Amino acid sequence: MIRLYPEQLRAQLNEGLRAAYLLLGNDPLLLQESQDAVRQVAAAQGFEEHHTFSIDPNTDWNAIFSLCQAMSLFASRQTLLLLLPENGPNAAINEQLLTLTGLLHDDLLLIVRGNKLSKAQENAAWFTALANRSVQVTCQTPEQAQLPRWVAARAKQLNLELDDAANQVLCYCYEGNLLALAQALERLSLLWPDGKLTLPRVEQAVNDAAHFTPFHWVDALLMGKSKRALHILQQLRLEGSEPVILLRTLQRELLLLVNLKRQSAHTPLRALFDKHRVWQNRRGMMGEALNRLSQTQLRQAVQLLTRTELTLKQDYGQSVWAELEGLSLLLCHKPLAD
Amino acid sequence: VLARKWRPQTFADVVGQEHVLTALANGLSLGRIHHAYLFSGTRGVGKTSIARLLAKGLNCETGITATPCGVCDNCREIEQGRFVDLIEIDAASRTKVEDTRDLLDNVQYAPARGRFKVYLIDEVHMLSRHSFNALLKTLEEPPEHVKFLLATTDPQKLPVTILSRCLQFHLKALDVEQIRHQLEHILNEEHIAHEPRALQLLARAAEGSLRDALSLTDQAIASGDGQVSTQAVSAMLGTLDDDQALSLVEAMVEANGERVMALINEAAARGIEWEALLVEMLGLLHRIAMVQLSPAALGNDMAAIELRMRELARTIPPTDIQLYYQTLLIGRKELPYAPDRRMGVEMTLLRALAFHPRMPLPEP
Amino acid sequence: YQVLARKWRPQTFADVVGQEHVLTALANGLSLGRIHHAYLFSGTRGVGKTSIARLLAKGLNCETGITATPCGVCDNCREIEQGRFVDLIEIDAASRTKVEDTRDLLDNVQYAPARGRFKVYLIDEVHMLSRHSFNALLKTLEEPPEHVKFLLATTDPQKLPVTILSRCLQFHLKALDVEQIRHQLEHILNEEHIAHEPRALQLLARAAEGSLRDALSLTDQAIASGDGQVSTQAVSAMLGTLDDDQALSLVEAMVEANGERVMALINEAAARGIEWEALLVEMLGLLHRIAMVQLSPAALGNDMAAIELRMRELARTIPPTDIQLYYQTLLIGRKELPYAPDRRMGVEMTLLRALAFHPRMPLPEP
Amino acid sequence: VLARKWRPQTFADVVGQEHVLTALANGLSLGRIHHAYLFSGTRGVGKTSIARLLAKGLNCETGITATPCGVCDNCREIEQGRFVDLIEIDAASRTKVEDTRDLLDNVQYAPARGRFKVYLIDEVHMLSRHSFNALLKTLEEPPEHVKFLLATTDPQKLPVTILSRCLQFHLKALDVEQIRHQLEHILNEEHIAHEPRALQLLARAAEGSLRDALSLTDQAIASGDGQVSTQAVSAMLGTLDDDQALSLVEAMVEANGERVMALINEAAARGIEWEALLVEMLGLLHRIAMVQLSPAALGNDMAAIELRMRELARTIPPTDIQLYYQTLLIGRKELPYAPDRRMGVEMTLLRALAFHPRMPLPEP
Amino acid sequence: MRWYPWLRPDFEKLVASYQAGRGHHALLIQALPGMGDDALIYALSRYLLCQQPQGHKSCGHCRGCQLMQAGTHPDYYTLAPEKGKNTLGVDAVREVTEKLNEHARLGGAKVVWVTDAALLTDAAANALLKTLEEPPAETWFFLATREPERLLATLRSRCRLHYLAPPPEQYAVTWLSREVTMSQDALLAALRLSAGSPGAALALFQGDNWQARETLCQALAYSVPSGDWYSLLAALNHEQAPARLHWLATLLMDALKRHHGAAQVTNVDVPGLVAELANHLSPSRLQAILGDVCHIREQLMSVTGINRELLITDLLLRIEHYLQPGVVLPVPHL
């Protein structure tokens, strides 16, 4: 299985077509790109019929299994596209795939797609099969160091002069959801055809664009002054956010916060962060919180969240926002006793 | 309803969506036309209005323009919704579930009248697993002369693949001042009466949903019978702020029975959700109690209040304040078990008054 | 002799009470013809939901044409005000016995008025419909005929899909303040030439909870027991409450710390068959008023008079602090009732508590 | 069966519905009658008895009187139900659904024997939409020589149109003593054996119903020997009928834990009614607390524990008994939150234990 | 369904009345769950539905014996709770009511069985009684409830209450020392934590459950002296939260139980654990904890879909709070 990057794919495709193509990674567009890059050469061969079946334990597998079991009377062929689960091929699916691993024939091109595979999942009978015929195309979101480079490269193919500083800002918001970044680019292509994206030009478009993730709220709450926090909240309403999703998002970060503070003298803040593995830059920020939130401030914040969560689901629609507001203010100043 | 009567006919007619207008306008001025658009945002922000304008500058007999002339038969029948080349589909309706499944399995590649065969699917996230893959197979192979204008209030319930082949445009809600200033106009050109207060009681009410604001403004004339006075506006939209909810707190610390009672009478006069009055009160007490710990404890709209609140913060011992929080708190908890709601409140303040820190009442 | 409950049943829109805003909105529509396909009326029970609903169907099929001011004589107006009109189908979704008449009528919509301009469908609480016929509406509402119009009423618009709420012109009818019904009933008895003690009207008033229809219903029972008079004594009788005198005569005795008198009056009272929870609702009442006059001697009603000298005494003589205790002591009293093994017991037990915890002369322990 | 035997014959024999008989009576004695009376009330509170007793006086050969003479033919006949002019309709009966519709359509504007054709409808609200209007039409045009007596246990299920034509009389549930005091009378006049308790228990059994209260006395007589006694009765209701009720309190108040705890387990084994047990304790905490306000409070059956009861009474502080009482009351409420209806009970006593004067105190 | 032994002493007499004429048409069996209710009703009924009984039991050939083994019969009606909801409707009954007014298809005795009478609507009930007031000739009813108290007085006054009391402790234990080997104290506790119903105790072990317990117990073991209750999260967080929560309680109450000197502790399994609790936890603090625990559990139980993690992770931290001195403790309310 020739392992290679999206970029070498077009080159490899040329030399010939291989039994099956494994698109593994989390990036929305590379997967897409690599995908269409494949089919573009298949229909270009004799593959008119194209199929796509998602892997979730609740699928209708007889349909699938028997659709490839059949050789065609008119040699018409097909392109089977399996959509791997979100979590990926569990134990029962290490076989379900091992089965379709010895059926392939030069007139049934296989293209599996999902997020990368774990060292374990990459030994599950099935993968080890394609292990000779196939090819895998690593599709992963570039890191913090190449993140901006990507935006620079790509931009350049969209015939764009995106300044470094204008590149940075963009890279700091939507820091990661490659999806949007790819978007805001073709959009900006549109604002200024034959224009330049100086820092003043992009920074405003982005500033005014004013989109806040409830993640933005939380992060503020991360000891950041309440001002922005509260604003991002009422803004986060006029973005028709559901309150249920705000609650549990802060939870993850508020609970995480309890442990960490709980583990002082357990292990230096350092070692700990890795351990939980959310520490992506948030480390400085998480730390900063863990310096002003008292063991008790935490709890209070946890009792409230609960009241909210509960009060949210027991009188279904008592305008929770009220409480959320108070809540945030709690995570920003010393507290009292009621 | 003023809702339909004032629907935008031109890009100059759209309230605060600049970053979306400038974009669409320009991509229309330089003949740059993608194969599919997607407008996302909340209720009555103008997703539909901009999609329709968009379809209109594309099929303007005057030519592909950022400024449809608005008088062509292409512009008129599109305005009417009776445009052969403007197939509108609702993925939200229960009744048209079949005409929504078929209009896509049978896309029409050749335009009947204008230059384009535009489609517009409201709440496009509401399609059937079937209709999805259908619109996917179509945008994967964008049939020319066939454009796709999508709208959704939740571009997240959409598969990435489809969102992948579109050009999204996030519309923001509208400012409370961006609306009040949009009414003051819509009104003054329809020669109707109004008070600056009323206009703000309305804008606010509409939660960034202009559509609603107007749909509300019609009723306020329906009930106010012609005039848009605060009185009629607040009639349906209760006294949404009344700095008395606080005036009661103070009236309470000052231990000015006469005012407390008086003030309640004024609230009762209007008729308020009693216990609401309690929580409100409490919660003030609760911030004032906060404020006096970390002064930077006054959020966004605390501004009008600001001075009033601070004064209390300082001038009143953190203890006495807990006493109130508590007393007040407790009175709510018993409220439904009071001979009568208002009484319950009066009677609970009376509590504080005799159980007051300084100033408590006497006996002979 | 003519139960007002019928003699004052609203006929025009003018006859309705205090719900102006929601009437004005209907005064227009009918006047400008802006007739929508669906009318929604939300509200507690007792608020003129149905009542105001007829006043629409009396202004839709009226021969005088579509008016906001129907004429009470045309054959259509009369039959409508008698629950029997060929195009006025009245469905009660909360109805058990009529469930099959509920399903068959919503799937069998007649697209042709038999005697009126439109065909009126009055539905009491639609959120209570069957999953089957509920959809019958959904569809008929999406694409409704021109002649068929709908009138919905709910005790809770929440449990109604947003698929229908958005498809109708909502109208929330607020219950009526106490002093509003108090005023009506006064103006109705004054206009029916019936004697009447103020104290007794407020009783009939609060008795009916913001429900004028009911307020009249009771007003009638009172008039029947009062032998042509609404006297505190007849009223309090029915309600099975305490005659302002007796409530205070307990309190008085409660304050005085003497059980006997208390327990005595309870019997004396249990004799008249009281409604136990109300022997407290009524004390609490007074205690309230007392401590209120200690804050402003002005705070005293206008019929309290018969007991005024006594109100004022207690007030000027007991520590507000103190009073705030009996009030709360009975308050939490009411609270427990449902769990006291007997509504009387709870009520006796509770005054003892007051007595055991009196603050000037508590019950003694050797 | 006693229930049928003691059906009221004259108003003076109706128990606890005064605000009613008061009216009705006052109505009759002044020839002031209506054409439609509606009687609302829960089960076996006296609906059918009063309507039947009204009709009995409306038609008495002696005259329109609130005091049926009860010896003239119309009265005797109304008593056995064989009164041609006493048309009893059961709007809840599925069997006669046809006779209902028939007779009403084939109405008798002309009474055969008495001065009024009286229609007595039970559970009116359960009427067919058809009947509803059939009736409603007759109420609009009340044929003279006719009166309608409506009786429902849920008046709300009725059409405001029918409601409005009627004079409404509600029937309140009977306080306990009331029911029990009758049983006493009954039993005496019938010369049967009875013990206080069995009478207490019996009353408490028929929740506020005098009808269930009697029919229960029947089954209870049927159960044991023709003798309404504590055993016989609790033998139907399976009640404890054992001083563990009290035997349990005593301990609690001495802070015996071991004992209380003990006492319960040994009680679990019997199969007690947990909630029921609480109910009894509060019960005693009361006859006690009350014995304290006046040494006469004790009454009829507790002459069996007189001494004990009195001992608590004179030794535990009035103040302290409230707190016990009150705590248990609370636990009765929370009885269902606790996983175990017993953990509940124990959870609760162990609660009044500590919160005692000198009870168990902390340590590491 | 599984006729256990202890159901014979009771099955004996009961049949003794159906064979002698002194049988009540209404038999309410008050009994725990997994104590045998189930089988004793099915058992008796089979005797009564025998065309040619052989004395104490059926023959197995006759139309009755056959149709009954077959399952479907013309006189055996099962009024269980509406499939889905958790209540019995007025309807189900009213149709089974008249369904008796017609003579026996096999001409003999008809029989009805109710899952748990304490599960019908006040309406569904009364609908019933009227049937019991007017008993349908040679017919037999059988009601069973866990708690006969929660059953309408007027109703329960129309049937014969039969207390399927559980067997002696030693007996039950033995009977279990056979079905599964475990330290006899883990067999006792397994019994006590079940009201004494052997069957119940049986299905505790019968899963990874009873070891799941151990897991928890151990936790507390440290959690108590350490003062770290947050650690419990581990053991309590999970689908079986209620179930487990109920355990943490029992122990708790055992601590209180000891604090006062009660002779009987439920989790005899781990006397070390309960005494340690009756230490770093004054009476009044178990109390509170027992409190929140019985509550929170219940929240999960009822409130459709709360965030279990949140709840439990809150309960815990707060407990810790209770512990901290100066802190003031929760009291039951209203």
Ligand SMILES: Nc1ncnc2c1ncn2[C@@H]1O[C@H](COP(=O)(O)OP(=O)(O)OP(O)(O)=S)[C@@H](O)[C@H]1O
């Ligand atoms: N940005 C805007 N500028 C001017 N008028 C607007 C704007 N948004 C809404 N309106 C008014 O609101 C009505 C509805 O707006 P639409 O464009 O249909 O909103 P929408 O965002 O598509 O809303 P939905 O269908 O509820 S998601 C129009 O007919 C206008 O009168």
Ligand SMILES: Nc1ncnc2c1ncn2[C@@H]1O[C@H](COP(=O)(O)OP(=O)(O)OP(O)(O)=S)[C@@H](O)[C@H]1O
């Ligand atoms: N208020 C009462 N005073 C004296 N005996 C009563 C009273 N209420 C009921 N009883 C007894 O209960 C039996 C039935 O009472 P009814 O008047 O038929 O009750 P009801 O309110 O009509 O009940 P239903 O039919 O269940 S709604 C009578 O025959 C009496 O023996």
Ligand SMILES: [Zn+2]
């Ligand atoms: Zn044009």
Ligand SMILES: [Zn+2]
């Ligand atoms: Zn008319």
Ligand SMILES: [Zn+2]
């Ligand atoms: Zn007579």
Ligand SMILES: [Zn+2]
């Ligand atoms: Zn047999």
